């Protein structure tokens, strides 16, 4: 029942403020120095902060200054991240961890250790957005030179800027299925999603042959339709 | 541009050993402990070393840490599947006054034959410049192990801003998928007349290009 919960994430808008806070059971929470640290998706861990046990020793990163502190209360085993001025880099999951144990030893003295971050949290999604219900713009990959290699040329559909999650994607009505690649969107720093699908087709079948991505987006009640052919 | 230096990722075959390296200077690991985390899909980071070299209870004795100057290494023996993580080193840096992490090491246990991927770079279409807005799309198909650094050019030069890349992904055939966006204006688009997608993977580079005459 060693435990650390964050909470008091969420979706916010730019600008705006949060409380992070971080619950602590089964120790001693006074005794021990903690950290936040923060994961963007996709991204390496980057510390935020650090505090003291008894809360008069901090230190963060230079990039929060002025908009983010780190505190906590003993009295309520919490300890709390004030962010200020939220911006877009700041999207990510929030971690707090233990650290430092504080203690006396069976004859008085005062003893510490450092772990490093030796119990983390199980994480709290901070979203920095004003994303919200939005149907793609589709745009034709054409096929070329350049995405040609002898027989075989590749074509695609673009979907931009949707939100949210998911968009479908067919081919002249799902008839064709052989090579059709539709990838992983990508979450941009607006909060709106992007992906785009590719069908590989033979280079002799460019002039005859019809090609149509069918985009389907159901929380927008969207759909397109769109022909994909070379470029004059 | 992570202060500490690891490498994007290793790879080695069940039951083989592998280890993966953290560089940095005299104000981090050269003198200040390091530690090193394990963090499996979707959950949190977990401590594997501490002081160097130490391990947490009920960490086994397959993970090992060491240290030579401005350099330290995490060693695992044993492999097994369960192993198939990302990697990060920590220390503490004295000139910054702050934790400092590894950029992360993905470590993939070799389940199939590396494969090289696939990459098609297309330009903005006309329709979208129409639309006052300009996206490259780097698609990159068919690789294995699930890890690539893309790195894109504007006339040679490096261009970071505007960049967009997903987390590589498994497709039906196992092997993985990415792609990576570039967002331009058309007036930077058709400014310059090159830009290119280099695509790095287990060591073998390509790289494509486009151009507004195109």
């Known amino acids: 029942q060693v435990q650390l919960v964050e909470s008091g994430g969420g979706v916010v808008q730019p600008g705006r403020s949060l409380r992070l806070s971080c619950a602590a059971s089964?120790?001693?929470?006074?005794?021990?120095?903690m950290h936040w640290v923060r994961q963007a998706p996709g991204k390496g861990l980057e510390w935020v902060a650090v505090?003291?046990?008894?809360?008069?020793?901090?230190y963060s990163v230079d990039s929060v200054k002025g908009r983010f502190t780190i505190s906590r209360d003993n009295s309520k085993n919490t300890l709390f991240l004030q962010m200020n001025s939220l911006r877009a880099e700041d999207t990510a999951v929030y971690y707090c961890?233990?650290?430092?144990?504080?203690?006396?030893?069976?004859?008085?003295?005062?003893?510490?250790?450092?772990?490093?971050?030796?119990?983390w949290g199980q994480g709290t999604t901070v979203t920095v957005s004003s994303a919200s219900t939005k149907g793609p713009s589709v745009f034709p990959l054409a096929p070329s030179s350049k995405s040609t290699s002898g027989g075989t040329a590749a074509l695609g559909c673009l979907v931009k800027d949707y939100f949210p999650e998911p968009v479908t994607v067919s081919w002249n009505s799902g008839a064709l299925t052989s090579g059709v690649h539709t990838f992983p969107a990508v979450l941009q720093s607006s909060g709106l999603y992007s992906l785009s699908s590719v069908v590989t087709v033979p280079s002799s079948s460019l002039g005859t042959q019809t090609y149509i991505c069918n985009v389907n987006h159901k929380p927008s009640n969207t759909k397109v339709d769109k022909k994909v052919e070379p470029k004059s | 541009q992570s202060v500490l230096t690891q490498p994007p990722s290793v790879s080695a075959a069940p039951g083989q050993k592998v280890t993966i390296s953290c560089s940095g200077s005299?104000?981090?690991?050269?003198?200040?402990?390091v530690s090193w985390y394990q963090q499996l899909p979707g959950t949190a980071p977990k401590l594997l070393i501490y002081?160097?070299?130490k391990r947490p209870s009920g960490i086994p004795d397959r993970f090992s840490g060491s240290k030579s100057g401005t350099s330290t290494t995490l060693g695992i023996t044993g492999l097994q599947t369960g192993d198939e993580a990302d990697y990060y080193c920590?220390?503490?840096?004295?000139?910054?006054?702050?934790?400092?992490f590894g950029g992360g090491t993905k470590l993939t246990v070799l389940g199939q034959p590396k494969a090289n991927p696939t990459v098609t770079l297309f330009p903005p279409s006309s329709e979208e410049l129409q639309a006052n807005k300009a996206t490259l799309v780097c698609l990159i198909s068919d690789f294995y192990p699930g890890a690539v650094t893309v790195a894109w050019k504007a006339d040679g030069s490096p261009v970071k801003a505007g960049v967009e890349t997903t987390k590589p992904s498994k497709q039906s055939n196992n092997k993985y998928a990415a792609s990576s966006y570039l967002s331009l204006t058309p007036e930077q688009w058709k400014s310059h007349r090159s830009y290119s997608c280099q695509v790095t993977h287990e060591g073998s580079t390509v790289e494509k290009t486009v151009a507004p005459t195109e």
């Open positions: 920590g220390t503490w840096d004295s000139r910054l006054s702050a934790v400092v």
């Open positions: 961890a233990r650290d430092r144990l504080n203690y006396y030893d069976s004859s008085g003295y005062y003893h510490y250790k450092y772990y490093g971050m030796a119990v």
């Open positions: 505090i003291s046990f008894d809360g008069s020793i901090k």
């Open positions: 002081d160097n070299n």
């Open positions: 089964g120790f001693t929470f006074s005794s021990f120095g």
């Open positions: 005299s104000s981090n690991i050269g003198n200040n402990y």
